[PDB]
Design a binder for these strands. Structure first.
Lengths: 97, 105, 95, 80, 339, 176, 179, 300, 107, 94, 97, 78
DNA sequence: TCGAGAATCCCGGTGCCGAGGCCGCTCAATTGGTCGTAGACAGCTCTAGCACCGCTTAAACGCACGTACGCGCTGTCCCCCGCGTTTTAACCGCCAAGGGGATTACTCCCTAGTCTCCAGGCACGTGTCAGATATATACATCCGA
DNA sequence: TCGGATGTATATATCTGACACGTGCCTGGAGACTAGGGAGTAATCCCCTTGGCGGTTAAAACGCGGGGGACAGCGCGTACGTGCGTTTAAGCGGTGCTAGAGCTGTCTACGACCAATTGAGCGGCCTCGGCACCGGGATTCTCGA
């Protein structure tokens, strides 16, 4: 009967995911999302597979960069947990809004 | 008599295809003669720089085959290449092993 | 059944110069192809806007040199300028 | 269709944050992240369909996605 | 008001609508569906009036009559039947040679209809029996000939498969006018469909190389047989190169509207001056099928895969009907009322 | 006789000749600060520019009345309408007399022995009507309320143009 | 059923507007910009920002349909700029007709009518606990009657001000006399 | 000018509701508030049948274009739909939260206007029986409704004295008729050009309105117009008479060029509230309230 | 040999067309400049210039002025949403900022 | 004795005197509007050139200018500018 | 003998400077700074005046934008006074470092 | 040396324009550092254009071209 | 809750220099005609994209339990602001000198262009070995003691 | 300070299909010779850029005082980790159909270029009127009581 003090599994998940390279979003829901929001700009399109792969790569890299800058803001605010106002501050400083 | 310009300068990247791409792209009216030689030299130096910095991590991860994780590490672990490639997403790239100050107990 | 143009063989040659005992996969070759095309088009665009700024109509090695010193950071710029000048001299000496 | 903005699950944002280096996450980041991802995918897909309909085809090749990302300022190496 | 501007709803009730046409009055709209269903709506209160599931076969052409009672059928087994708005029963039935494209009644008598096949000369029949009058066309080579009546019922304008127009009489075939248009520089091309106005004698030429020309029904009679007239107004597009599918007119010969065939679009020119003045849009990836203008009010009905959209001016509510003595001003209005 | 400096309607077109009132759009009534107390004070009003569409309500008013009171508001102010000569007194509209010509020399007068009254419409000595009767005693400054900006002058001399014939008056060389 | 000759068949009201429902710095008007810049966008906001519905105080009240922030303009109270003795004739006239007095004054020389000509700004009741006030501005001399706000006001609240008879406000320190 | 009584059609067990001719001009059936609608003739009083099957009272009854299909404004929040040639109670219109006083048809004869005592003028159908739209016009119950000549404008007559004119396409107010007094408007109708409306308000003073401008033109004097929904008609068969109900055992019939007191019919024993003319014949219908229960057809 | 009407008023425009076609030839944007592309482009430039000068002149009247100074252009660009999304990274000389005090600073 | 300079002062002056009949413009705002016109011209021409190079063509038609305007301008301003351009081309056509 | 409660003069200075447009750095020290750091890239240069004006405009606009984004960060951190770690966080999120 | 020309009130007035309520006492040193970095990164490209043109004078168009490459696009000159 | 005082806002008056308009005088736009080819149109092909089907199963899910963190209040202490007094170099008006920017004339040699001849880089077809996948096992970290 | 238990890194066995390499070849790059035009370089001139001198005052610098915020601490209660059974659709293969991208043959309609004539656009020189500057008094916001 043993349970870890909370935080250690988080730290080893951070090391284990920063080690390797893979894809972190399942490809069938992402493909249905791409077809879903492409439906409203032109009806009856027909995607290749590598285009879906390229969109997945670009979106994942953008999200990871946003989370790093958000965590810098939150550590500046003398806290630990990310709040969504930190995300809004980062997106307003960078110039995207 | 078939002295290719790559041999006549002692280079590796070809010069005729670079002159073809500078005539086809419509950059200006007339193109000189030393410009594609100069440009092939610059591109050779940049590619040699990136492969030289890739080889270290290629040997350090006990591998004999360069992978995109090696290219990601070799680009991001420098200072000046990290300014030249200011924002470029590399597929299957991965990130830096970074954990902040106050997170550890 | 059409011809596509790339840069695989030349990156392969430079790899065999600098590391004589290794090989490379396909994905890294495609990444290096895209990198070479990116740096090429950035330098060509900067040189063209310089040549139009100076009211002339010719792209020469002088404008390519000014484009490189404006574009790259320091140490890499100095080494690349030395490489280019050595290549120009060793080309025009045995014309 | 209505779903698949909610089909992006909720270990997945946790796993993206633990690739990014996040320790403890509150309970609003899920909907905030869904909103941000939807905005960004709109501003890519619109230019992709613009290049497609200008080229006079009926598919979306990879090169159009690379061109839209290149004009936004986020270059992608590995598909051109 | 004038030409429409805003979207204003739809009627997405009946599945698979295909064609549409109006009466003289502007309150009757039948729709030949994808399975023989002929549905009429209301316009003032907008309720479905009468479904006429006539054939097991799809319908490709219809036309209303002058009394507001009679219709005409065109299925994929060449069946032409007389209908009624009171009963809705089948009268006539026989088989043509296989293609039937479009029919048109005589304007000042509901005896005669003008029927057009694909690879034959257009044929005029009566409604008393199966009598048919053979109409001669000048070429008689490809036999891809279109024909229509004018407005008042004087002549029959025909259009061949080569680019020459004949003007015949409705019974005696009096060739009284003809003209060849200088189509670009070498090739003279065919005509898709010619339609006619309600005030005057203006009409349009819809070629197969995407140029609309404007003419009158008096200048050609003045030029006589084998004359060379000029277009009163040339209408074309250059940017998207714009193929066409359907042409019709405005209310009292004021403007000209023409639906497209690629981008699901509606364009509104001016017959008076001669410039484009408004572009409409809609769903980006549909396929425009049939466009009908409303004769006594600015309404346009467009079929694109079942959906019938009604651009209807977007009326704006206000005050002064509640209390007709209070005037809702905009700024300071000072005065004295009685001297 | 000069006009007032402060006891006047301010936003009217004040003319520099100091004998001519020029109006505005609306009934903003100037009261010139030299009027009767007792006895007799007669002056004439020479008319220079009277364009049409004007309601030149002329008569008597007190300094109790509003500056923005049109002449013809209450029991103190009197009324003489251009169209159909109508009186408007204590808000009572009764079509009284006829109109009036253009280009004459106007002028009103009250006769009160220190009361027996002559409140009667006066125009070149020609009567247009017996107006009213038996006022109270107070201050009656002359009141001008116009509809246009009409150039109308004023007279004070003893040698009148068309005075009321055999008039008991006082010259304006004493208190003005 | 056809046996009720019943009363309440008189209205005495020209305004039968009342229906069954009675539902109760990103912009320019909340900036620190000069006044006519806000005065332009005043009319583009006020045509759709607020609404008029039935209130328990006196008939119809003013329930706004937008979350107004503190400090900004809302709407203009405009109409016939009457001059000061026609007021008394209209008092006698609307005493004869039986309709109340709608007269706010810009200054003590010229008043502004609302009953004959105006806008939807007439539906503002008096209260002794307001959340708005009034300032007159100078749009090129042509002055106006524009109403600001005081505090942060949400969706579904009546807007009032002091006009300076027992009042139907029920204030904590009410005056109960509107003179 | 010489209208003479032919037949007296009595027999209503309660107060006679309304006399309405056939729209094609051959019937004069008369109903009553006794939940019973009889089918009487117009030229000899030819009787057919009595409608039975209601639950509460009857205010208005209507017709068809072929004068067979029927409907009545029933006072149990319903409008039961009927027929002459079959007699089956066809449908029953729900959707009311108060009593119903009047209903009519467009000339295309497939819509039902419903100005009921729930004060929101709904728009009902005949083919489907469906409430299309709603005109929340007045805070007072509806006295009468009417379409115009083609079927494009609806007038609103109510207690407050606001004769508004309403759109049919999207249903909005266009104009509000106003007055210094507040009389209850009883029963108005349009003109054969749609540009004139005779006002019948409870003030003992009739009015005729210029529609396109908004003023009153020609009136009457010396009449009793005080209590109920007093009806008005037209007459072009004889002179330009104005057939109207009357409370003093008369029938108010005078001409509008003359505006005088020239002819006064008499014979009723209660307040006359419903009159109508045959569209071609010299037949003027007349039926007073509960203490009369008779029909007097004065024929020229 | 006759009179020559220009290409600036044959389409009913104000910006020149020959100068735009010369700047598309003398730039090496591509080889062969098309038929009506400079007309289309000059119309677009006209529309944008009219759109910004409307707001500029309106603010210039509302500050009780008659000429225009670049503070008005700063206000007219930075007030609207669409032009602020277009002109992102631009420093107008003599420009100035927009009044924005935070919520918690003032008492 | 000076070399001529290309400018846009007269054209800005004309459009200003069409849309505001009284208000004048100083020197510095004229220089700013000159730079703004040159800037938007550079962006649109560059994007159209990159498109026509992508699609294996050699010709900048009007269609590439339309696609460049649709890619570059945000939303409603593009929806107005496309219609203004198409109206201008149609008036120039006949 | 009167002194304001501290803050009011700061607020009216904020309003007074956001009203008008001027140049906030004296031009002689800025000109000597430009010549001073231009000395090390090429000896014996010779500036025009308008180039000095252009450099002054660009530097002043850049500093004002940096201070606005820094104050957004500091108000996010539930404080008032700007610290230099806020400047470093803003410059690291924007991508310049 | 003469980096002291950017004095203490000037950074204070720039922060008053920026909309700042209260300032500590390290921002001056940080601000002089950031300003010196930015002016170096502009004047480097201006001097590069001037040396390529074979002249001895820095003009305005060279500074405008360097600011265009940085991505800031100053108007009002040239 | 009140009064004395201190900045802003508005009005009247002067006056002056830079927008505004006139005048003359040049370069390139325009039309009218030629000549060559870029792209539209049609017809055939064959292969990636979309759909049906079924089996197995990693994991997504929902629900228990604690505990470390977010937050709110209290103190205190320290340091940035507001004002007054003394000082020094920013700003302006002012003149003198000459170095490089700007323009013209005149050779002239550097790249475009056309063809003829060849070799090298690309698609396609076969073996093979770095790594992916199992088994087994020291030991090392963590929370309990 | 010391101990039991899982997870991970280290060491070997087995398969396997991407990677490396060998071949035919066609098309794009090099060699020779010419035209003329953009640029290289001398040559002159004139004004804008540097340099200084003297006077005035607006701004800068330096002290003195205090109250308002930054931060440390402490109490508490709660929202989010960590672990355990299930069920479900994600994923892998196998089979099947076809719309649509891609090549290929022809032609004709549209854009580049040459010479002249015009005429709109730019350079230069008066001239006033809208704003620059400044004294005066009403209004409005502050803060101690």
């Amino acid at each position: 009967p043993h349970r870890y003090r909370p935080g250690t599994v988080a730290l080893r998940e951070i090391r284990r995911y920063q080690k390797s390279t893979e894809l972190l979003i399942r490809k069938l829901p992402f493909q249905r999302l791409v077809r879903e929001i492409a439906q409203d700009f032109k009806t009856d399109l027909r995607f290749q597979s590598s285009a879906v792969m390229a969109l997945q790569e670009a979106s994942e890299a953008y999200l990871v960069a946003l989370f790093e800058d958000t965590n810098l803001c939150a550590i500046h605010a003398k806290r630990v947990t990310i709040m969504p106002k930190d995300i809004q501050l980062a997106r307003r400083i960078r110039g995207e809004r | 008599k078939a002295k290719t310009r790559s041999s006549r300068a002692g280079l590796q990247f070809p010069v005729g295809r670079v002159h073809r791409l500078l005539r086809k792209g419509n950059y200006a009216e007339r193109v000189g003669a030393g410009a594609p030689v100069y440009l092939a030299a610059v591109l050779e130096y940049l590619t040699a720089e990136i492969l030289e910095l890739a080889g270290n991590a290629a040997r350090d991860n006990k591998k004999t085959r360069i992978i995109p994780r090696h290219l990601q590490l070799a680009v991001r672990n420098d200072e000046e290449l990290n300014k030249l490639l200011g924002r470029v997403t590399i597929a299957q790239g991965g990130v830096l092993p970074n954990i902040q100050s106050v997170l550890l107990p | 059944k059409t011809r596509k143009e790339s840069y695989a063989i030349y990156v392969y040659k430079v790899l065999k110069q600098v590391h004589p005992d290794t090989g490379i996969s396909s994905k890294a070759m495609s990444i290096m192809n895209s990198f070479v095309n990116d740096v090429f088009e950035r330098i060509a665009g900067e040189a063209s806007r310089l040549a139009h700024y100076n009211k002339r109509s010719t792209i020469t090695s002088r404008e390519i040199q000014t484009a490189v010193r404006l574009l790259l950071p320091g140490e890499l710029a100095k080494h690349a300028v030395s490489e280019g000048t050595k290549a120009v001299t060793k080309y025009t000496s045995a014309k | 269709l209505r779903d698949n903005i909610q089909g992006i699950t909720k270990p997945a944002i946790r796993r993206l944050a633990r690739r990014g280096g996040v320790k403890r996450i509150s309970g609003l980041i899920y909907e905030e992240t869904r909103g941000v991802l939807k905005v960004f995918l709109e501003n890519v897909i619109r230019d992709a369909v613009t290049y497609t309909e200008h080229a006079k085809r009926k598919t979306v090749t990879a090169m159009d996605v690379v061109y839209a990302l290149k004009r936004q300022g986020r270059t992608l190496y590995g598909f051109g | 008001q004038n030409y429409p501007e805003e979207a204003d709803g739809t009627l997405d009730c009946i599945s698979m609508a295909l064609t549409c046409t109006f009466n003289r009055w502007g309150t009757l709209l039948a729709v030949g569906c994808n399975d023989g269903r002929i549905v009429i709506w209301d316009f003032l209160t907008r309720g479905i009036a009468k479904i006429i599931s006539a054939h097991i076969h799809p319908v490709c052409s219809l036309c209303w009559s002058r009394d507001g009672h009679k219709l005409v059928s065109a299925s994929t087994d060449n069946i032409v039947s007389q209908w009624d708005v009171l009963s809705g029963d089948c009268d006539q039935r026989f088989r043509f040679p296989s293609p039937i494209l479009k029919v048109q009644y005589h304007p000042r008598d509901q005896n005669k209809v003008l029927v057009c096949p694909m690879k034959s000369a257009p044929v005029m029949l009566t409604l008393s029996d199966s009598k048919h009058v053979v109409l001669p066309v000048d070429d008689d080579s490809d036999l891809n000939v279109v024909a229509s009546f004018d407005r008042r019922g004087e002549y029959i304008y025909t259009g061949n498969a080569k680019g020459k127009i004949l003007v015949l009489k409705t019974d005696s075939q009096d060739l009284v006018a003809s003209f060849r248009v200088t189509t670009g520089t070498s090739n003279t091309t065919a005509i898709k469909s010619i339609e006619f106005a309600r005030k005057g004698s203006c009409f349009l030429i819809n070629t197969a190389d995407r140029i609309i020309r404007v003419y009158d029904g008096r200048e050609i009679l003045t030029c006589g047989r084998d004359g060379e007239p000029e277009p009163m107004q040339k209408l074309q597009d250059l940017v998207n190169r714009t193929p066409w599918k359907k042409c019709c007119f405005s209310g009292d010969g004021e403007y000209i509207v023409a639906g497209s065939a690629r981008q699901h679009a509606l364009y509104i020119w001016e017959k008076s001056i001669g410039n484009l003045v408004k572009i409409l849009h809609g769903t980006r990836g549909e396929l425009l099928l049939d466009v009908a203008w409303h004769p006594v009010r600015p309404i346009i009905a467009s079929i694109s895969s079942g959906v019938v959209s009604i651009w209807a001016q977007n009326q704006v509510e206000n005050w002064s009907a509640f209390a007709p003595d209070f005037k809702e001003l905009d700024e300071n209005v000072e005065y004295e009322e009685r001297e | 006789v000069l006009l007032a400096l402060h006891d006047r309607a301010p936003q009217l077109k004040i003319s520099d000749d100091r004998l001519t009132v020029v109006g505005e759009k609306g009934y903003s009534m100037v009261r010139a600060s030299h009027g009767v107390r007792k006895g007799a004070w007669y002056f004439e009003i020479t008319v220079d520019e009277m364009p049409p569409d004007t309601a030149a309500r002329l008569g008597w008013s007190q300094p109790l009345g509003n500056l923005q009171a049109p002449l013809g508001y209450d029991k103190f102010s009197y009324s003489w309408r251009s169209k159909k000569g109508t009186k408007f007194h204590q808000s009572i509209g009764k079509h009284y007399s006829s109109g009036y010509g253009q280009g004459d020399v106007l002028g009103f007068y009250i006769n009160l022995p220190e009361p027996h009254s002559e409140i009667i419409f006066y125009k070149n000595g020609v009567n247009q009507g017996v107006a009213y009767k038996d006022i109270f005693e107070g201050v009656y400054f002359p009141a001008i309320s116009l509809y246009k900006s009409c150039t109308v002058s004023i007279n004070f001399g003893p040698c009148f143009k068309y005075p009321p014939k055999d008039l008991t008056y006082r010259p304006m060389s004493d208190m003005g | 059923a056809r046996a009720e000759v019943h009363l309440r068949k008189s209205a005495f009201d020209m305004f039968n507007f009342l229906a069954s429902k009675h539902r109760q710095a990103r912009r320019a008007t909340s900036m620190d910009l000069p006044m006519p810049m806000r005065f332009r966008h005043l009319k583009k906001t006020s045509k759709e920002a607020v609404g008029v519905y039935r209130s328990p105080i006196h008939g119809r009240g003013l329930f706004c349909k937008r979350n107004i922030d503190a400090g900004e303009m809302v709407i203009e109270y405009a109409g016939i700029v009457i001059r000061s003795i026609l007021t008394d004739k209209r008092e006698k006239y609307y005493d004869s007709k039986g309709i109340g007095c709608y007269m706010f004054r810009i200054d003590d020389s010229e008043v502004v009518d609302a009953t004959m000509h105006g806008n939807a700004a007439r539906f503002i009741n008096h209260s002794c606990e307001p959340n708005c006030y009034s300032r007159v501005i100078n749009i090129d001399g042509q002055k106006h009657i524009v109403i600001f706000a005081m505090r942060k006001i949400y969706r579904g609240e009546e807007l009032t001000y002091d006009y300076k008879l027992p009042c139907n406000c029920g204030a904590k320190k009410c005056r109960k006399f509107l003179n | 000018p010489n209208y003479a009584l032919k037949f007296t059609l009595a027999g209503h067990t309660k107060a006679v509701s309304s006399v309405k001719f056939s729209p094609n001009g051959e019937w004069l059936a008369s109903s009553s508030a006794d939940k019973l609608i009889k089918i009487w003739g117009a030229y000899d009083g030819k009787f057919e049948k009595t409608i039975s099957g209601h639950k509460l009272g009857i205010s208005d009854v209507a017709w068809s274009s072929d004068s067979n299909l029927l409907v009545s404004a029933s006072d149990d929040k319903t409008l039961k739909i009927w027929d002459v040639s079959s007699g089956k109670c066809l449908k029953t219109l729900k959707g009311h939260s108060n009593y119903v006083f009047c209903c009519n048809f467009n000339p295309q004869s497939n819509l039902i206007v419903s100005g009921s005592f729930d004060e929101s003028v709904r728009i009902w159908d005949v083919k489907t029986g469906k409430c299309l739209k709603t005109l929340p016009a007045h805070s007072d119950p509806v006295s009468a409704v009417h379409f115009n000549r083609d079927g494009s404008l609806i007038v609103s007559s109510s207690y407050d004295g606001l004769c508004r004119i309403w759109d049919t396409a999207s249903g909005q107010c266009l104009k509000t008729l106003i007055d210094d007094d507040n009389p209850p408007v009883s029963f108005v109708k349009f003109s054969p050009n749609g540009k004139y409306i005779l006002a019948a308000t409870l003030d003992n003073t009739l009015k005729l309105w210029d529609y396109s401008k908004g003023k009153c033109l020609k009136t009457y004097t010396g009449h009793k117009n005080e209590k109920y929904c007093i009806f008005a008609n037209f007459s072009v068969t004889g002179g330009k008479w104005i057939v109207s109900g009357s409370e003093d055992n008369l029938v108010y019939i005078w001409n509008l060029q003359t505006k005088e007191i020239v002819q006064k019919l008499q014979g009723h024993t209660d307040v006359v509230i419903s009159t109508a003319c045959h569209p071609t014949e010299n037949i003027i219908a007349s039926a007073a309230l509960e203490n009369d229960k008779t029909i007097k057809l004065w024929k020229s």
